[PDB]
Amino acid sequence: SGIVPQLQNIVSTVNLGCKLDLKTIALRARNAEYNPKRFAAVIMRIREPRTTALIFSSGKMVCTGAKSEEQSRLAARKYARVVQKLGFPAKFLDFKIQNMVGSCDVKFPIRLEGLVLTHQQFSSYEPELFPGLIYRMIKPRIVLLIFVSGKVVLTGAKVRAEIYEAFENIYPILKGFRK
DNA sequence: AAGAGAGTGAGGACGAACGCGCCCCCACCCCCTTTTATAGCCCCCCTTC
């Protein structure tokens, strides 16, 4: 096809294996913000990997914003080490990528009206609710946002191969509906 | 041969039962938050005349 999706967001969850005191972490952590009224977790952000991590008192943490699997793990390790430096016995257990988000352009306009008619069983096109077309890929469990401008967003993938496979499947379909 | 007490028929007030709710407590789910690209829609605020 000549176009490879670019991972825009990587969401991974890891378990530190230790109950945490959210109030203590916020008071000591450099970039952590805690608001039990708003959310029950602790939001911490770092610059070099450019990721945001939510820390829960149960010891489980969710890292988001990473643009690659390697960055996500490194960012998650940095958050885990920071909590460890605060006096907790934080570890790195069962690190897993929960969701991957990719974006790409087909370099041509797409007729969403024709696409949904031919793929009604997978396409839900409601301009009132959202201008983009929501395509739910089946063989890969991937949900794709196809837009008239040609931009395509892939989400719900657990591994990078799923993103590339999903885009490969959809590209010929989109090519047939070129405007 | 004559008094209180009583049988009977008969009317009037009261307690337990029957509903008939209005309030409550326990599952179940949803929502909160964060990240990201995308495009359209819409709202608040600023500026020009």
Q: Is the CB of A130 under 7 A from strand B?
A: yes
Q: Which has the closest alpha carbon to A79: A93, A62, A96, A94?
A: A62
Method: cryo-EM
Query: CA A117, C1' B43: Å apart?
Result: 34
Q: Is the CB of A9 under 7 A from strand B?
A: yes
The per-residue DSSP string of A103-157 comes to EEE-SS-B-HHHHHHHTTTTEE--TTT-SSEEEE-SSS--EEEE-TTSEEEEEEE
**Strand ranges across the sheet with A123-124:** A33-34, A42-46, A51-55, A60-66, A6-15, A93-105, A151-157, A143-146, A133-136, A123-124
* Resolution reading in Å: 2.8
Give strand B nucleotides closer than 7 A to any protein Cβ: 32-41
Q: Which tokens belong to A106?
A: 């087909």
Q: Which letter, b or e, does each residue of A17-32 get, where b requires 16 or more Cβ atoms within 10 Å of its Cβ?
A: eeebebeebbeebeeb
Q: Which has the closest alpha carbon to A61: A47, A49, A73, A50?
A: A73
